[PDB]
Amino acid sequence: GIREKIKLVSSAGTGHFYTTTKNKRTKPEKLELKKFDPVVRQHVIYKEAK
Amino acid sequence: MLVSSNVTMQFGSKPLFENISVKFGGGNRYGLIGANGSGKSTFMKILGGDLEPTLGNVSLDPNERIGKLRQDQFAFEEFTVLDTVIMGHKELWEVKQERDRIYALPEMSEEDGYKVADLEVKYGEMDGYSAEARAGELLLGVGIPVEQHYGPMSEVAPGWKLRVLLAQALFADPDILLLDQPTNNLDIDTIRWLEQVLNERDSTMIIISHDRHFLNMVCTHMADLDYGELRVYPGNYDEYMTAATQARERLLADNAKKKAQIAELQSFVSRFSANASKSRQATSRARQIDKIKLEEVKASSRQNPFIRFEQDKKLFRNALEVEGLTKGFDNGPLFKNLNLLLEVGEKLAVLGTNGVGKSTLLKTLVGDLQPDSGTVKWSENARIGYYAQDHEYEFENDLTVFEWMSQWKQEGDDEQAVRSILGRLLFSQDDIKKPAKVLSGGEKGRMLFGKLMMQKPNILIMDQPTNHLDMESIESLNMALELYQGTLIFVSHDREFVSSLATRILEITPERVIDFSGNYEDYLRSK
RNA sequence: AAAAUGACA
RNA sequence: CCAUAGGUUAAUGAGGCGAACCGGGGGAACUGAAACAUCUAAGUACCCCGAGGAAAAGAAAUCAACCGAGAUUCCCCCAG
RNA sequence: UUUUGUAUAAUGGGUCAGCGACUUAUAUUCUGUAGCAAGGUUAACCGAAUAGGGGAGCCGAAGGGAAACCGAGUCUUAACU
RNA sequence: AGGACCGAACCGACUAAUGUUGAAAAAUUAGCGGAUGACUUGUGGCUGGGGGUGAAAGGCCAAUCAAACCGGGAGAUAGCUGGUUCUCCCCGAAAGCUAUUUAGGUAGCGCCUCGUGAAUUCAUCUCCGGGGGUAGAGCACUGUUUCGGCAAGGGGGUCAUCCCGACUUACCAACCCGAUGCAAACUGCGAAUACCGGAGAAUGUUAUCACGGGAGACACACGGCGGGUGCUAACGUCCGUC
RNA sequence: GUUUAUUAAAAACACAGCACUGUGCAAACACGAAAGUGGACGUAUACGGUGUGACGCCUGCCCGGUGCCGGGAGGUUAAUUGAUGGGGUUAGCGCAAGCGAAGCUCUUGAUCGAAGCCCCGGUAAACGGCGGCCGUAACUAUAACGGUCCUAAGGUAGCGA
RNA sequence: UUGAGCCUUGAUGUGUAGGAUAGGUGGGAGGCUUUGAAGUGUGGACGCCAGUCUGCAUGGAGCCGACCUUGAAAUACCACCCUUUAAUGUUUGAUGUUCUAACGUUGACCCGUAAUCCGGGUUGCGGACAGUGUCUGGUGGGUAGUUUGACUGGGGCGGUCUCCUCCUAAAGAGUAACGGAGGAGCACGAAGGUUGGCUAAUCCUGGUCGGACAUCAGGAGGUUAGUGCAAUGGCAUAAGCCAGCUUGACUGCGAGCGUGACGGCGCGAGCAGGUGCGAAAGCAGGUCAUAGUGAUCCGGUGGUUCUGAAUGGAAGGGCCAUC
RNA sequence: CGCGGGGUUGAGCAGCCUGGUAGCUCGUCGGGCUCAUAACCCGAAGAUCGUCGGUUCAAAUCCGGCCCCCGCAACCA
């Protein structure tokens, strides 16, 4: 529907991303969640991308 | 010898121009036009490369020079006139600031040792040793006198301020993204001057102004951005006017051909459907309707805001009373006495070439700047509404669109009857939940028209109302002031707005301020 | 430039 | 004008037939895909030209792999 | 014969005699039987030619992984109770 | 003079009868139209198969024409009909689910058969441990319904018909109280059977499960019981169980 | 007069007459892979295609749609041309990562680019089309009449169970 | 005639402030001049209009340079180039007139020839047009190959085709009809996690606007309220209602089960690594649960030497995440 | 009760076009011009946008039910 797909690309430098959905009409700003990066095995920040 | 590329941008709900794919190059000047609050300024702001788009189609040409005049014509009251022109060279300016921290640094470091040498050798390589002199000759070449070269930009008339800002753009660059809406400089003389400078310069430039006549003399191609994308129509402006308003008409006729062909296949389907002999043929066109797919029609952003000003007390005898003004800032006074009377009407179009002090007359006519006069003696129950020539202090403190509009009211309710007034002048539901400082151009102006809607100012000023309006709000504003009951004292630079709107002329030239000739169709006729 | 009509006695 | 074209005479060769095999010039569709158009059937059926007792091919501007083999043709594997 | 079902008024046959419909080739899998048995077996071809040579090659005795690779282990995973 | 008139040869074919395994694979008999013209006829040529010719009917092109005849590809393909040949012994179904350009076809499973390997594996009965919410019943709930009592309130008229409503009605009438019914999509109650698990004797040529070779079948019919639909009609139709 | 040889002989086909349209001659058009033939040993009072069908009175309105004809200003647009940007390789520079000349390559594609279409007019004996709702006249009925909406235009003459 | 590129030469290019219309690099301060000058008159051209400028003899031999305001020095000098420009040539494109020599001739005459075919010759007319070949855009039922669903109380029309909730469904699971009733193709960065706290509908009485019905104070009642969304089951330890902190809406696995003919779908304690809340016990692998969704092929983006058709690379594949 | 279209001021019609103003031509009324009526000039009146609901701050407009009007269909052997 109105909810489209984004990917949260990690900030640890490695290429890893959690893919989710986000409604843009209500909120046009980015998403920032501290998630787990299996490449470096640590909890790092995941800024929205794509 | 290079060209530009495509982009796509969105500041929230309903993305703006949705996968633009264009190229700009050659010598032809793409006149970029569009309705208020739709792409334009921010489309070519992306083109400059300082901010990147969302979808990120990217448009790269990192070898040649870009010089950009912008819309914020008052964005620097502090830098001296020579500094603003020099800052048009981005590399020179940023290098100098980090270099200039020499006399402001009382102690030097080891790493600072070759750093100051590294910055200085870059300064000489791009010959910053002549930037002050190189700009000065150019700055003198566009009409700015010498004595104001070292003065601050705070004390320069806005009409003159464009001549400085165009000199900043002209810094040996083979393209310029001109945001030049020649708002203040509409003397016709200065307009005719700027038409020669751009015409006799060979560059792949872009112009954005709303002036229909100005786009004729200069631009060769047009890049209208109206519905959801930009289409390039060669021709000047009025060879454009036919195609843009005809390609729409031929689409509505084609769209209505299918909608009338479907409705005639439904004559057969609805009649001979249950029939045994004609069913196989009715279901042959019952599934033919499902393959037509008439193309969708989008609404043009060129709408007409509906604004009207209504009074609250309507004084009856007269409004103005000026005895002798004799106000001058640092030179010969701009006016000597200026005995004035308004007499409840007399829309009093102040006029004159830029730099003679028509805006300083209105500022001291309302009581902000104290004159050496003897008071201006407003009426008993005057409710003054002010629309200053520069309006940027109001749009601050990051209030939202709904928040900013809301405080201006006296008896109406906070939820409704201010949404309608704010939404009457083309503000959608999702457009009012964003900060009021991020608005652009006409919407900044349209707010100040709405500001006087609820205020209901019995007496009006409207310093320079038709500045960023999109040729449709001008027709609405011209109609709104025409049936307005009351008094307003405006100073406008174009001719048709003053001519059609009711008038009692007061032109300002050194030294005598000529007062009154009637229609302004007779003021020029007397000449 | 527009300018039609008016019951018997 | 010379000369060519043309004409006559003489000598030699060819012509046509034949079952299959062989080289070349053209070349389908039914059919399968559980319909059908890419594809398959298939360079098959058929038409035409040529030759021989056989015909084509044939003596590396080929393979292989840092070791080497040595023109062409046919059979068994590699291998469904 | 076809059917849920036929004396069926559903099909076929006038009768006799002769002919008339699950085959052949090459591959693959399973059962029976025979030979040899961690081995079994040759094909083309040579051959006084159902003998004997021919072991090119095929199947099996080792699997795991997409693959490099490892190997009674291997893959996943940073590593597996 | 005439694409003139009546009318035989000549060219045709409007009506009726006979004929219909005929005298004839379109004729005979009695009538009928044209009959100097766009007529008719003899002999010889030319046009050929997606082509010919057509005063136009899809007509004629050798008794064959919405694409001739002969031979070849060719034993085209046919989920469709028909047929399938000697004998005895053992076991012995299905007409269901799921999917399907699928519904009269097929694929996997269910059901059959043969071989191998396995556990008081499996079946019946008694006792024990269980979850129901069907039949029945009931009206606290969801709806519905009839009486009787009280009665909010919604009306009807009477007034200066200005206010307060001051007085009236032959009205209706919600909520609660007592009594009386109905329900597949109601439940403060609730069986019989069935089903799942455990233990125990007897009986049953393993009847049970797993793997592997071969299938057939997937059009069902009637009868009893519980139903949907129909008219509690149909040798009607769709389910469950025997 | 012709037609379904063999169930239809007719109102069907043909016809003289009428109109439109193509064709300037090596004519248009047709049969031909092509050479070549017919048209025609003809020459616009000729030849081909289409529709109507003696003769008489006539043949009304609509060019919006689809065809055809004319226009060339402008937009879009093929092959062709290959300007630029990105990558692969590596002589060398470093004896680290990395950078990268020349050449050869893979790809992107600036510029040039006609007809057609979009656009502007014409043509209906070119294919085709040719309207609603409301009110109103001395009893009743009906509208000569009026209002309004729409369309490219709203069926005229004649005829009418 | 006009565009585009290339070479050669010559000209060519300030205000700010001065003796002056000085382009950049700085090598240098001595060149220049009589291989005829200072000034004189005499003419082009250009010119933010003072001047550069060079044909010109005569006059005939001194001018320049350094200095001087300047961000910078100076046609005082030469070279290496830059800008704008004219002339030659130089290679090409576009158009317009002409020309003959390719090509055409189904114009005329002669010969082969006892020949309205064909060939050769002479000539006239068109003439690089026409026409043909390869490539390409448009048009193209003239022509050819083919498609044009199923269920169904015969076929057509209408309805339906996947998923969720209740009844029919006969008290385990399942169970059909063109049987009776309703929904879905989403939403949420909080509407998720955790910690702390809280309890409704509807009525009566009293109370300013205020009213059958807002907000308030007491009492009855009991979940008859509520749940993002249809229905069923559920919910007080609340799954309903508020607030604080936060990202467990996380990565690799997974004993053991449920349900499907399969493809698949669902539940899941616990183990390893890293988080959040709480004092802690503990809870957390999305939401009260059940709808909110489509396999394979083909291709796109990112990561990863797993492979890399002689070798080193690379293209291309493979694996992981994803469209 | 199967399918479409319509309901706006006295008549005929827009405005639904992606929600922020109830509009056009006639018509009624009160004046003015005229001897008087038409024509014409000036000024105003009326609509719950069929009704009742539902997201909306806000509905003629978006969604749902009902009423009324106008058409069309309800097949062949």
Ligand SMILES: Nc1ncnc2c1ncn2[C@@H]1O[C@H](COP(=O)(O)OP(=O)(O)OP(=O)(O)O)[C@@H](O)[C@H]1O
């Ligand atoms: N920072 C932003 N983020 C998101 N959306 C934005 C932002 N700034 C502006 N917008 C949106 O983009 C719209 C266009 O703004 P823009 O600056 O392009 O004006 P404009 O159309 O050029 O107007 P004008 O002609 O008056 O100059 C704004 O009206 C606003 O709705």
Ligand SMILES: Nc1ncnc2c1ncn2[C@@H]1O[C@H](COP(=O)(O)OP(=O)(O)OP(=O)(O)O)[C@@H](O)[C@H]1O
């Ligand atoms: N604060 C000030 N200090 C010094 N001079 C000033 C100041 N404000 C204005 N001036 C000068 O006095 C005059 C007044 O100009 P002002 O800013 O009032 O606008 P204006 O002349 O009306 O111009 P325009 O028409 O461009 O708007 C101008 O010459 C301006 O340079």
Ligand SMILES: [Mg+2]
């Ligand atoms: Mg009259």
Ligand SMILES: [Mg+2]
């Ligand atoms: Mg021979």
Ligand SMILES: [Mg+2]
């Ligand atoms: Mg097939």
Ligand SMILES: [Mg+2]
């Ligand atoms: Mg088939």
Ligand SMILES: [Mg+2]
């Ligand atoms: Mg040979």
Ligand SMILES: [Mg+2]
């Ligand atoms: Mg060697």
Ligand SMILES: [Mg+2]
């Ligand atoms: Mg049977």
Ligand SMILES: [Mg+2]
């Ligand atoms: Mg039967």
Ligand SMILES: [Mg+2]
């Ligand atoms: Mg019997």
Ligand SMILES: [Mg+2]
């Ligand atoms: Mg019978």
Ligand SMILES: [Mg+2]
């Ligand atoms: Mg009998």
Ligand SMILES: [Mg+2]
């Ligand atoms: Mg029988």
Ligand SMILES: [Mg+2]
């Ligand atoms: Mg039969």
Ligand SMILES: [Mg+2]
């Ligand atoms: Mg028989």
